[PDB]
Write a protein that binds this DNA or RNA. Structure first.
Ligand SMILES: [Mg+2]
Ligand SMILES: [Mg+2]
Length: 126
RNA sequence: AAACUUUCAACAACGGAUCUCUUGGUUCUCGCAUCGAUGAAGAACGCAGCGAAAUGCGAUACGUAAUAUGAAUUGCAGAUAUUCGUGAAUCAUCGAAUCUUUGAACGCACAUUGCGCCCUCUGGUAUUCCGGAGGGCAUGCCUGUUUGAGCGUCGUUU
């Protein structure tokens, strides 16, 4: 149960804050858990998904698929994986949208800011 | 006997009830004190690579600066855009700016994009005319400055 007077248990307020979330807020909302191998490598359990991460799909019809994130399509609350494509009868392929909470990050795209973020969260980066 | 009329059932119509939802409303409580001549509230007209509206903004026009953050935006397109970084996106934050024509609305006027005057600079052979750029000119009242008015009145000299 929540104790703080600054926390709201309102369903309408919580949903409004989600669907009207800014792009910067949606980066944190689109977090993904790390795989077991990366969790012991970095001592961090989840990170906001980023463009050049590699993920393994763990839920849905594409469970077991792997690929590199192509875009964190923050407007649709989804990520698009490298070769997770649906082929229309037209012959054209549209990417399949997957929520980041339904994948595990298997390889991180690292830069000076990701490492500081991992070290900020108590982990180890380099 | 058909057709026709009426009733019922099945399927299809017409229509949008019912059910289930809900970024809305309503009411209660808690906390706070912050509009404007330093130009408000409001109005009009504009502004996007491709927009009519809503939203945002003002010729720096769906925004400029700054701080933070840290890879997007996305319907399509596109960098003389970006990725171990003064660096994508961001009304995230916001302390610097821009802020058209107006509006208490202030040169005068306004059913007009009407008409002046002053200062500096500038173009046309120009203190005077015509053009342009920038800066100014409302009213009531207060304090002060300067210039004044009145046999209202004080001193002095014929
Ligand atoms: Mg209902
Ligand atoms: Mg007239």
């Amino acid at each position: 149960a929540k104790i703080s007077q600054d926390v709201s248990s309102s369903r309408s307020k919580a949903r409004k804050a989600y669907f009207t979330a800014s792009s910067v807020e949606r980066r944190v909302l689109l977090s993904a858990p790390l795989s077991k191998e990366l969790r012991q490598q970095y001592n961090v359990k989840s990170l906001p998904i980023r463009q050049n991460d590699e993920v393994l799909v763990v839920r849905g019809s594409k469970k077991g698929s792997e690929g590199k994130v192509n875009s964190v399509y923050r407007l649709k609350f989804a990520i698009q994986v490298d070769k997770l494509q649906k082929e229309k009868s037209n012959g054209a392929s549209v990417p399949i949208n997957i929520h980041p909470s339904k994948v595990v990050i298997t390889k991180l795209h690292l830069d000076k800011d990701r490492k500081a973020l991992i070290q900020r969260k108590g982990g180890k980066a380099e």
